[PDB]
């Protein structure tokens, strides 16, 4: 067996710029061996939750496709990335299905994403006509229609810009602080599995 191409997990955790929540990346990691033990065996990860599989058993049962997605979100709602949980960002910007199958990892990054004056770069949605289907982007800069008066493009008290900024400050409360979140979803399509474990 020896070893072969190892999955570029670093290039999704150790990158430099993370996309805002409203428009998240989707790396199609495939045909590589991923060693999740090194990921789990580390104290740098604040929250390490999994569903459908225990975190200390996924190193076997070669999978078909693994989707890695990233956000930077306020710490005090990280929990609501879990299936079913309702709230504000989850119900408009990212909602996992109740039959979700994957792992949610999150760690604090106060040393990088925050700035002395406050890095207000990341944005999140605030309004929408209805809820969001699972696993779909919502890139749209069209003013949301509140009430019933039409919105021709001019911002108004019922014509709200969908996005707004976190407004990070590296002195706020622990909850207000940023957190880098990585969602590793797994899918078993009927086809030869292509992402196995280290020893195999």
């Amino acid at each position, epitope marked *: 067996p020896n070893i072969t191409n190892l999955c570029p997990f670093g290039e999704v955790f150790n990158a430099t710029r993370f996309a805002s929540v409203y428009a998240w990346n989707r790396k199609r990691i495939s045909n590589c061996v991923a060693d999740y033990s090194v990921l789990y065996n580390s104290a740098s990860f604040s929250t390490f939750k999994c569903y459908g599989v225990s975190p200390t058993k996924l190193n076997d049962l070669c999978f078909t496709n693994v989707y890695a997605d990233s956000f930077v979100i306020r710490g005090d709602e990280v929990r609501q990335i879990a299936p079913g949980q309702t709230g504000k960002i989850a119900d408009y910007n990212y909602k996992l299905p109740d039959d979700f199958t994957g792992c949610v990892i999150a760690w604090n990054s106060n040393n990088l994403d925050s700035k002395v004056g406050g890095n207000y770069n990341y944005l999140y949605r605030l309004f929408r006509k209805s809820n969001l289907k699972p696993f779909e982007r919502d890139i749209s800069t069209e003013i949301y229609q509140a*009430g019933s008066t039409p919105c021709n493009g*001019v911002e108004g008290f019922n014509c709200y810009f969908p*996005l707004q*900024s976190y*407004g990070f400050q590296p002195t706020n409360g622990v909850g207000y602080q940023p957190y880098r979140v990585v969602v590793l979803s797994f899918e078993l399509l009927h086809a030869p599995a292509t992402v196995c474990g280290p020893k195999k």
Partner: antibody
Amino acid sequence: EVQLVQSGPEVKKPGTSVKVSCKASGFIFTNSAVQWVRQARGQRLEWIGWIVVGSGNPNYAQKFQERVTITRDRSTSTAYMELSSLTSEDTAVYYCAAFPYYYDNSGSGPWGQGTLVTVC
Amino acid sequence: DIQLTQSPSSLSASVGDRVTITCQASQDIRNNLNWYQQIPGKAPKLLIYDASNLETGVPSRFSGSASGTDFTFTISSLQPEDVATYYCQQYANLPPFTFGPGTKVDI
């Protein structure tokens, strides 16, 4: 705790733009909206400018367009105002208002002390 | 564009009278209409927002009422000391927040 103050420049130069700064405190700033109005001697009050802290669309009335600019300012909680083509009847008090609960269909937020922007 | 008008434009009363300020707008704003105070020497502040929905720090005598597009601002305990100028302020889903002509209530 919720209130705001302004600077006090008087005359930059006739026929040239002026700078007015407003700061506020007591309420979360990157959720609300701010706006600018003119008060001329004679107790006549008219609206001039309005900018939301969210994204930024400097929308103004038809009369005063291409002649004014309001810039978003997250220093701590601020905004800067400018307007060109100074004339003989631009002397006035430039009042700042802020709707804190912009995302709610409600109006609130105290007003600044007024900037006496005169011409000479 | 939206426009409105404030008809009283002047009051002359001393005590007790339920003094009313009636202003009417070109459009029947649902409820996004408020009123502003202005002392002859201070900066304007807020008295009632959202069509007579009072705000923290308001006095008791200040109130208001609505009837279709017509809107009334009422003082049921008019006193000789609460002398200033008033304005009824409009805003409904469009940027132009044109101002009314105001009113200087006087004894």
